[PDB]
Amino acid sequence: QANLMRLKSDLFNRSPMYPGPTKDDPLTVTLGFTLQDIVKVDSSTNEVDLVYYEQQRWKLNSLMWDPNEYGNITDFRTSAADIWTPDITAYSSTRPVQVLSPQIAVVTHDGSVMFIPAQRLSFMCDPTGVDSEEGVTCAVKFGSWVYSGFEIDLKTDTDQVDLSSYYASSKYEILSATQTRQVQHYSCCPEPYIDVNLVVKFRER
Amino acid sequence: QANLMRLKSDLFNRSPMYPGPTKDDPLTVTLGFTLQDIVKVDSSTNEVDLVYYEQQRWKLNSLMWDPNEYGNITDFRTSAADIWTPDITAYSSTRPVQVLSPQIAVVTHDGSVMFIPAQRLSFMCDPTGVDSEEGVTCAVKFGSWVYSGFEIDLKTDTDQVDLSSYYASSKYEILSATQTRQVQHYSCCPEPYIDVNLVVKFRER
Amino acid sequence: QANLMRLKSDLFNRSPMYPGPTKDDPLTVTLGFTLQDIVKVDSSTNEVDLVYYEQQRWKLNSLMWDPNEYGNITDFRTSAADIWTPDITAYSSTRPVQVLSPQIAVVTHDGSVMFIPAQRLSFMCDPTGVDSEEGVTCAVKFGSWVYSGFEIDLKTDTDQVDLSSYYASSKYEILSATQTRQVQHYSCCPEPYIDVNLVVKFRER
Amino acid sequence: QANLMRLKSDLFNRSPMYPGPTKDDPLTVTLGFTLQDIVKVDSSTNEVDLVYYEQQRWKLNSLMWDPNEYGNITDFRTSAADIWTPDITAYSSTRPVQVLSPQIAVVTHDGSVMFIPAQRLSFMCDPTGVDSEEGVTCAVKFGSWVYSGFEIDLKTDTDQVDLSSYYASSKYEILSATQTRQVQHYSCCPEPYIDVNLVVKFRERRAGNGFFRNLFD
Amino acid sequence: QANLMRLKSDLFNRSPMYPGPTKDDPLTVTLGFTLQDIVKVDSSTNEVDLVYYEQQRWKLNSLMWDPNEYGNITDFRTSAADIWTPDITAYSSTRPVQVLSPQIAVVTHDGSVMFIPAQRLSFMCDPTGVDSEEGVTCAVKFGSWVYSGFEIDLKTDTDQVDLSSYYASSKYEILSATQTRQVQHYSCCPEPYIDVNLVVKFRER
Numbered sequence A, B, C, E: 001q002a003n004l005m006r007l008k009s010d011l012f013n014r015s016p017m018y019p020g021p022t023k024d025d026p027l028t029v030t031l032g033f034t035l036q037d038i039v040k041v042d043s044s045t046n047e048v049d050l051v052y053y054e055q056q057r058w059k060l061n062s063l064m065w066d067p068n069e070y071g072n073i074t075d076f077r078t079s080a081a082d083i084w085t086p087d088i089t090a091y092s093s094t095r096p097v098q099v100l101s102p103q104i105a106v107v108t109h110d111g112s113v114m115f116i117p118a119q120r121l122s123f124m125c126d127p128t129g130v131d132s133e134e135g136v137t138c139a140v141k142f143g144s145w146v147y148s149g150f151e152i153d154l155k156t157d158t159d160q161v162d163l164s165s166y167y168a169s170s171k172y173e174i175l176s177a178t179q180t181r182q183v184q185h186y187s188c189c190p191e192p193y194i195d196v197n198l199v200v201k202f203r204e205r
Numbered sequence D: 001q002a003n004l005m006r007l008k009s010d011l012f013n014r015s016p017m018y019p020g021p022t023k024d025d026p027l028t029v030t031l032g033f034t035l036q037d038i039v040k041v042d043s044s045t046n047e048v049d050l051v052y053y054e055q056q057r058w059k060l061n062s063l064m065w066d067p068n069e070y071g072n073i074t075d076f077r078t079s080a081a082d083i084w085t086p087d088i089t090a091y092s093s094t095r096p097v098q099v100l101s102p103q104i105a106v107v108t109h110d111g112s113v114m115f116i117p118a119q120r121l122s123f124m125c126d127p128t129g130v131d132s133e134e135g136v137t138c139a140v141k142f143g144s145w146v147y148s149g150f151e152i153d154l155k156t157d158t159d160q161v162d163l164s165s166y167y168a169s170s171k172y173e174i175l176s177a178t179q180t181r182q183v184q185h186y187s188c189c190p191e192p193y194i195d196v197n198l199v200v201k202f203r204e205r206r207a208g209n210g211f212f213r214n215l216f217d
């Protein structure tokens, strides 16, 4: 505790918070989804509700430290309010996302942060054909709300959504779930736009 | 980060926050809507729920800086709690507006601020006829709650609401969507009052 | 901006907040209602839901200033958290009041404050007969929760509720809406209590 | 305003808050209910919803002052976040209690504090038989969550719930409502626990003016 | 009061808050459940709603004192916001947990803390068969969100959930309820992960 308090103080109280990325100093955030449940489908409003947890990762030189100076501590946990977090959001949600987990992050001595909020999300999706053998496919994009691809570069580690914790007795069964980086360019607008497209194909059990 | 930290410190910690406009120093705010979804209609209460995002824009001298003094940085993103924002509100909502996006704004060296809250709104609207070929029109005004036209002047860049991201598989289709600056005048008072009237004509798919 | 910053600072950072009224220094508050919609009726719980905005007004010697000393500024807007506000509450609500407008108030150089929260309120009301020509009458009292009439004197400017902004296509039409000051005693206490009685007569369109 | 500001400052800024009661310095809290409405019943979850206001009263020496030294001020209102309050809770609720009144309290020069939150509560209750001439009875215990009877002693002034503001046109009519102090035990623990047991017997409305005759309007 | 004020001040104002455990200084948290009610089942979403209370216990050298120096005080209550708490969370909820009790803990002179939040939880569970003699089983794991078993070691005192306050007129009867410590190891990483699995078998009354 002596040594950890000393590290946290040295990292957080001796200088302001990371101000976020610029064009000259971009930052790469990695995203991944572990999909736990399709809880509910509303065919009268074309809204579907997901429960998942979303792995967010990035690396900052300012959160970097030598373990030998702090009792061989190599990583620590701290409230997410003590650090910058990227403004990643679902672009087509219909309710404010609900947070299901303590808002804490893991910081590693190399400056890696790992943040994994569990969320329930309602989003835009017509579930028509969900009750066929064939199912229905729905999509939702995730990305930064105000940073372009010149400041925040998104990335995935895999295109397969982790289904190893999907609720086996869910009401809907997953036929496929992928997570794909998209880059997009619109001649109106000098900057590129990056998102991760969460595509889920599912049907009634 | 060195430079942007300095800038943010200079802009935000060396002086108080912009106190908002007065009659001698009015401010012009520009509003525009991007309509994503008519989620739901309640014919028993005459309430309709929209999901959209609202582009707010203004310019303050106090937020201005010379890029050559801050590592050629020309703009930055920062939390909306760091800056003044206009009190723009829907005048005929029936629930508190629910915010769907992270509350961050973009600030540019010329003193421009761009703030873009994504919201779900319930508002007063009689959807009788929504199931005809002919649809129903419904209207909701937006404007400052406590500033007259002598302190905040509202403006739109175009009268066409942006429908380029309207959900194709929504449950209601949009027949037309406009956004019009209006100048009201209550028979008591001299000050002008100013709103942007969102009018949506729509029908059941 | 320079002058208004100076004013606000002078008013809000040079002394503590108004502590509220006392028996020796009572404060008069004026209340008025602008009724926008009867949204909903629930005949299984006898709960009715109103959207309105409530005009609150009072005057404080400590919020008073000479315009000549502050660039001829005669009034300003500020966040309702910077000033004392009266604890005016509905006495027969069934859910916490929901606030629908930005929490900002206008302060005038004579010390007048004006505050206009928009609210949705659910409250105790039997709507049996709403479907007749003749409608049903329901009532809700507003007043300070903890201050007697010796500290806070409530007042109306008129007994008529303002219906100039009642939603034309509401599902219920208003036959009459009055707002009446009532003085009410108890044996415990020399002190009179004041409420404003909102009485709405309405029916199904 | 000068004098009150001075008083509040003296009481609140010159020392820390009351840390709460100890076994050597217990505190007695007096509870009373005013029942406004049984709003709702859900026979598919056995949850009933009450709207009431709860009168909490207690007395601290550290909140005490001589009026003569503060412009003959004998009492004042202040935000409940400025003072200690007791952790009184419903023991069998099914949702977080919702607060319907401003969180303000009244403090008196003898150190008395009075705090009266209006609340809506959902709680465990099987309303089967609510539609009979004979009604259903439901019960909910209120007490401290973490302080035993050696630290907080609960009390009621009367065992009758106040029904003088029960909603006349409610959907359910009250046949009886009481509020009784109770002293629990358990094998583990020599230390008594104290609750106030709110018991309400009610039915589905059958006449414009309720079950019991009463003279006064 | 004098002595307890002195103690709270000494424990809480003289030094920072406990920063949380580390590999070199792990902390053992004991968990136990007292189940009050299965409130509700939703067979259309496979969500069940529990009301329970969760006993949490741990011990910290920094919260330790000698009673002889503080008027023979041996323990005290204080707001959970004054001390560190573990980030114990349900792993398969479908809504944010709702807290039904005041957030206060008991601290003992030996450094033991005891914290007992009453909660309502909606969580993933298929209730098909609940209406049989035979009932249905459901399970939800609890554990730290971001601390591994090298930092937080979870324990139970007993595997039996306390049913001595289960609602006798609940709508569902409890056939069995157990709480079991589990250790899992993932191929990614060297450190073990601990959870307490709450298993409840029930049926319709």
Ligand SMILES: c1ccc(C[N@@H+]2[C@@H]3CC[C@H]2C[C@@H](OC2c4ccccc4CCc4ccccc42)C3)cc1
Residues within 6 Å of the ligand: A091, A092, A143, A144, A145, A146, A147, A184, A193, A194, A195, B034, B036, B106, B114, B116, B165
């Ligand atoms: C200056 C003005 C506006 C913004 C807001 N961003 C703009 C518009 C929304 C957000 C993120 C991005 O727009 C994304 C977005 C993201 C990827 C591909 C296309 C789009 C098209 C508009 C859109 C519509 C709904 C929801 C999200 C988006 C760029 C940011 C800076």
Ligand SMILES: c1ccc(C[N@@H+]2[C@@H]3CC[C@H]2C[C@@H](OC2c4ccccc4CCc4ccccc42)C3)cc1
Residues within 6 Å of the ligand: B091, B092, B144, B145, B146, B147, B186, B188, B189, B193, C055, C106, C114, C115, C116, C165
């Ligand atoms: C429904 C219809 C119109 C509105 C528009 N706002 C409402 C009314 C005008 C504007 C701003 C404000 O009205 C102001 C107003 C503005 C600031 C503070 C108080 C008031 C109420 C006094 C007043 C008196 C005469 C004319 C206007 C006003 C609230 C709001 C809801």
Ligand SMILES: c1ccc(C[N@H+]2[C@@H]3CC[C@H]2C[C@@H](OC2c4ccccc4CCc4ccccc42)C3)cc1
Residues within 6 Å of the ligand: A055, A106, A114, A116, A165, E091, E092, E144, E145, E146, E147, E186, E188, E189, E193
């Ligand atoms: C369903 C089953 C289990 C959980 C909770 N566990 C899962 C895995 C450990 C623990 C909390 C968290 O996972 C930790 C974990 C813990 C802290 C910070 C990051 C991570 C990253 C996911 C991960 C990957 C490999 C090994 C451990 C972890 C989610 C949540 C949902």
